[PDB]
Amino acid sequence: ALHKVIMVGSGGVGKSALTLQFMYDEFVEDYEPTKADSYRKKVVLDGEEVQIDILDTAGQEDYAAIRDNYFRSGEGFLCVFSITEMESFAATADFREQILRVKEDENVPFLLVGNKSDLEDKRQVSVEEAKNRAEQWNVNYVETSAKTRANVDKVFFDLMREIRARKMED
Amino acid sequence: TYQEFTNIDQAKAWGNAQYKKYGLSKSEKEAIVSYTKSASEINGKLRQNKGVINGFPSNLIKQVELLDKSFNKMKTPENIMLFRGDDPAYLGTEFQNTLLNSNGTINKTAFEKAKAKFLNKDRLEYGYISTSLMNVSQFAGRPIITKFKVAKGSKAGYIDPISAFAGQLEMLLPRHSTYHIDDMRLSSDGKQIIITATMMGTAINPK
Ligand SMILES: Nc1nc2c(ncn2[C@@H]2O[C@H](COP(=O)(O)OP(=O)(O)O)[C@@H](O)[C@H]2O)c(=O)[nH]1
Ligand SMILES: [Mg+2]
């Protein structure tokens, strides 16, 4: 099995850091903001060997044709905001809307990810408002830190589980 | 050394001379006209997302693409000084209600903090940058004046002719541009911060 994950979210929320933390168990700071890359690794997901594919989108230049293409091919989405940036939380609705527009499936595997949980001291987005949005969207909300590793493996594995469940029909 | 226009008619002649060579498409013109009506919204969403556009609705993302690509046709033939005026929030939300003294002068504590924050540093702008060939009335009453040193060959479009909504002598710069703040000083007034910056260029370079 190959579970195709797309990272979405405003610039600077930690898409790259989260991807590189998951992939290589390292905290990579200030990864080139406008640089996109695709990753693939074998993981054991509930006893079964599977491959995860992660597209760490840059997004600054991902015009209609480009983003529509990878939204269509992507099977699951980590919709990342930073808990220290309300604007990034606000923007999550936009990524989701555009994802929903192309996939035409509200049951699309999707996790709302509040990143930079190590920066509680700078929090702008309440857990309440995020959880409420997640509930509204019928998705799980997880708070992560690419810095401390907090819930990083969890978001990827949980999303894979959702993609796998979605694939179970058919 | 950068050309700095000292006369409106000269600035217009220069601008027209560039504009004539652009050969913008109907859709590029429409995108630019729209920009001159809707800059606040487009630039706001760009800033909100730190330049990321893949959450933009169909109309907006198509407009962004058209705008971005239009700069392939719009270059300055010459080192040029460009101007814009800004309100305190340009310096950060912490300056919004803080920059100004009660008498209308720039608070010197706030100014030193802004200098500390920005002087001798690169700044990345997520929105497109609307500027003028001169310090026009639109900008000249604002508390912050920025003079951009824009190098020969840089993406920069004279869009005054394209739209009635275009600012006086408006020069548009591409989004996601970096500039380096070289100098920050108070006007003789004490009522304005005058910022001098060197435009470095845009990350947005569609083939
Ligand atoms: N403190 C902290 N910083 C982070 C975290 N994740 C990313 N960053 C930093 O936030 C900035 C943006 O991260 P990046 O991965 O480039 O975000 P992206 O633009 O969405 O790919 C960089 O300086 C990262 O080092 C985190 O969990 N905690
Ligand atoms: Mg990144």
Write up what this structure looks like.
Chain A is an alpha/beta fold and 170 residues long. Chain A has a single domain (1-170), classed as P-loop containing nucleotide triphosphate hydrolases (Rossmann fold, 3-Layer(aba) Sandwich), CATH 3.40.50.300. Chain A contains five helices and six strands; from the N terminus they run βαββαβαβαβα. Chain A has helices spanning 15-24, 64-73, 86-103, 127-136, 152-167; strands at residues 2-8, 37-45, 48-56, 76-82, 110-115, 140-143. Chain A has a six-stranded mixed beta sheet, sandwiched between helices. The longest helix of chain A is centred in the middle third of the chain and has 18 residues, at 86-103. In chain B, the strands form two sheets. A five-stranded mixed beta sheet of chain B has the order 1-4-8-7-2. In chain B, strands 3-6-5 form a three-stranded antiparallel beta sheet. Chain B is globular. Chain B has a single domain, classed as Toxin ADP-ribosyltransferase, Chain A, domain 1, CATH 3.90.176.10. Chain B is an alpha+beta fold and 207 residues long. Chain B has helices spanning 8-19, 26-48, 58-70, 108-118, 137-140; strands at 80-86, 122-125, 129-132, 144-150, 157-158, 170-173, 177-186, 193-202. In chain B, β7 and β8 form a beta hairpin. At the A-B interface, α2 and α3 of A face α3 of B. The PDB classes it as protein binding/transferase.
